[PDB]
Antibody, heavy 210, light 213 residues
Framework: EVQLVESGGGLVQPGGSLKLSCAAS????????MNWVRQASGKGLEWVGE??????????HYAESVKGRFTISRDDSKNTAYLQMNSLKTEDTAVYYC?????WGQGTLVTVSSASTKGPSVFPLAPSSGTAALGCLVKDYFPEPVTVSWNSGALTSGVHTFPAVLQSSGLYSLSSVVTVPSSSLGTQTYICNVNHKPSNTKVDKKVEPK | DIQMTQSPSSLSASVGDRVTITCKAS??????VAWYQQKPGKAPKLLIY???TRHTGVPSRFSGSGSGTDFTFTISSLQPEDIATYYC?????????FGQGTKLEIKRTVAAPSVFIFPPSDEQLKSGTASVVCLLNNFYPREAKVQWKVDNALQSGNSQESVTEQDSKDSTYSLSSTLTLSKADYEKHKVYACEVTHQGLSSPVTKSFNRGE
C-alpha cells in the first residue's frame, strides 16, 4: 500500500542538470524524513542526502561527494520529494533511489555521458527442429535500460533475461530467452515485448521456427 | 566519517543453513544500525532497524543484534529466495554510511547445462553483421567454459558472455555467449559450433549448425 514512484531520470551531458521526483503515497508524508541513495552498476549503496519534516525546519543534509551540487526539497501538499542535480559528472552515473526511511522506490537511472541516444534492433533467436528454447536479441542501444517481457507478461516461467553487455562499439546489447514445451511450437504464439524508453522505441517480436 | 565494514564480503551456504554476517562500526553508534536486503534486479528492502527491530512484513528467520560497535545479521534457515546482497547502515550521525555489502550465494548439487545454439536471422544479415548465440541453461556451479568454432577454427576475441544471477527457486545459473561476425565472414563459412565444458557433463557437449541449411 505504501508507494514511492521515482521519475526524471535519463541521459544527460557532463556538466548539465537534472531534477528527480519521488511521488509518495500510502503514508502521512509530512511526518517522514525523505532520503536519496544511489548505486552505480555493480557497486554498493551510497547515501545521497536527507530532508527532514517541517517541524524540523526542512533541514537538509548531504553526502560530501554531492554537497553544493545537489539540492533536496519537498512539497508536502503534493506528497513529493525532489533531487535537483547540478554540475553533473560522469561519476554521478547511477540508479537513484528515494526513501521515507522505511520503504524504497524502484529507482531511476541517471546516465552522465556525451554519447548519443540510440534505439535497438530486435532479432529473433528461433527454436530448432521435450523442451525447446527460443529468444530475442536486443542489439546496439544506448543508454540503459531496456525492458523485455513475453506475451505481454503472461509468460514468465522459464524466462531468462540476461544482464546487458557493453559492446566494443560503446553500444549495449542483451538477450532474453525462454524454454517451452517442444509440442507447443507450431501452436502457441511467442512474442517478446521490448521497450527502450530513452529512444522511444517499442517493439513486439514474434519468434517462431524458421 | 564512520566506517562500516562487513564480514564476509561474499558467502556460500547450503539451503537450511544458519547464516551469519557481522558489521563493525568504527565508532560507537549505539543501536542506530539498519540491515538491508537487495535481490537481483530489485530495490533494497529494509529488514532490521534499531539494530534488532524487525521491519513490518519481514520473515521471522531474519534477525539482528548488537550494540555500540559490533552488529550481527542472522538468517536462521537459509531459503532459496534469500539470494541477495546484504548491507548494513549506520544512522547515528550524518553522513549516514553503508557497509560494502555481503553477497550471499547458495550451494546445491551439480546440475548440467542444457545447450542451444541459434544462427543469426536473415533480418540481421541485411545490416552487415551476424550474431551467433549459444545458451547454457540451468546449471550449477557457475564455472563453465564455452568455446566457439567456425569451420574448425577456434574463435577468440569476438564473443561476449552474460550470466544471470542465481535463480530464487532452483538456485541455478544461466549463461549466454554471443559470437559477433561481419556478414561477409559469416557467408564465407559453413560449420558454426559452440562447445560447452562443465562439471556436470561427462565430456564436452557440442551444439552446431551449418549455414546453408
Amino acid at each position: 500500500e505504501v508507494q514511492l514512484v521515482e521519475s526524471g531520470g535519463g541521459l544527460v551531458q557532463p556538466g548539465g542538470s537534472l531534477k528527480l521526483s519521488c511521488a509518495a503515497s500510502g503514508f502521512t508524508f509530512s511526518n517522514y524524513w525523505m532520503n536519496w541513495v544511489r548505486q552505480a552498476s555493480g557497486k554498493g549503496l551510497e547515501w545521497v542526502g536527507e530532508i527532514r519534516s517541517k517541524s524540523n525546519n526542512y533541514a537538509t543534509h548531504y553526502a560530501e561527494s554531492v554537497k553544493g551540487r545537489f539540492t533536496i526539497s519537498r512539497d508536502d501538499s503534493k506528497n513529493t520529494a525532489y533531487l535537483q542535480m547540478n554540475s553533473l559528472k560522469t561519476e554521478d552515473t547511477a540508479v537513484y533511489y528515494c526513501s521515507n526511511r522505511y520503504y524504497w522506490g524502484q529507482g531511476t537511472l541517471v546516465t552522465v555521458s556525451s554519447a548519443s541516444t540510440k534505439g535497438p534492433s530486435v532479432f529473433p533467436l528461433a527454436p530448432s527442429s521435450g523442451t525447446a528454447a527460443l529468444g530475442c536479441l536486443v542489439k546496439d542501444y544506448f543508454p540503459e535500460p531496456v525492458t523485455v517481457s513475453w506475451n505481454s507478461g503472461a509468460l514468465t516461467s522459464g524466462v531468462h533475461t540476461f544482464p546487458a553487455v557493453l559492446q566494443s562499439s560503446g553500444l549495449y546489447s542483451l538477450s532474453s530467452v525462454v524454454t517451452v514445451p517442444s509440442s507447443s511450437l507450431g501452436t502457441q504464439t511467442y512474442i517478446c515485448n521490448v521497450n527502450h524508453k530513452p529512444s522511444n522505441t517499442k517493439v513486439d517480436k514474434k519468434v517462431e521456427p524458421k | 566519517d564512520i566506517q562500516m565494514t562487513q564480514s564476509p564480503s561474499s558467502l556460500s551456504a547450503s539451503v537450511g543453513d544458519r547464516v551469519t554476517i557481522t558489521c563493525k562500526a568504527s565508532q560507537d553508534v549505539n543501536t542506530a544500525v539498519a540491515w538491508y536486503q537487495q535481490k537481483p534486479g530489485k530495490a533494497p528492502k529494509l529488514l532490521i532497524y534499531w539494530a534488532s527491530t524487525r521491519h513490518t512484513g519481514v520473515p521471522s528467520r531474519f534477525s539482528g543484534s548488537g550494540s555500540g560497535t559490533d552488529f550481527t545479521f542472522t538468517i536462521s534457515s537459509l531459503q532459496p529466495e534469500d539470494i541477495a546482497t546484504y548491507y548494513c547502515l549506520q544512522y547515528i550521525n550524518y553522513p549516514y554510511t553503508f557497509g560494502q555489502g555481503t553477497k550471499l550465494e547458495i550451494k546445491r548439487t551439480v546440475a548440467a547445462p542444457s545447450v542451444f545454439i541459434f544462427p543469426p536471422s536473415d533480418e540481421q544479415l541485411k545490416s552487415g553483421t551476424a550474431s551467433v548465440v549459444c545458451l547454457l541453461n540451468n546449471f550449477y556451479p557457475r564455472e563453465a567454459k564455452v568455446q566457439w568454432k567456425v569451420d574448425n577454427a577456434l574463435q577468440s576475441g569476438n564473443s561476449q558472455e552474460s550470466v544471470t544471477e542465481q535463480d530464487s527457486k532452483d538456485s541455478t545459473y544461466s549463461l549466454s555467449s554471443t559470437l559477433t561476425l561481419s556478414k561477409a565472414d559469416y557467408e564465407k563459412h559453413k560449420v558454426y559450433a559452440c562447445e560447452v565444458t562443465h562439471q556436470g557433463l561427462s565430456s564436452p557437449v557440442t551444439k552446431s549448425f551449418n549455414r546453408g541449411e
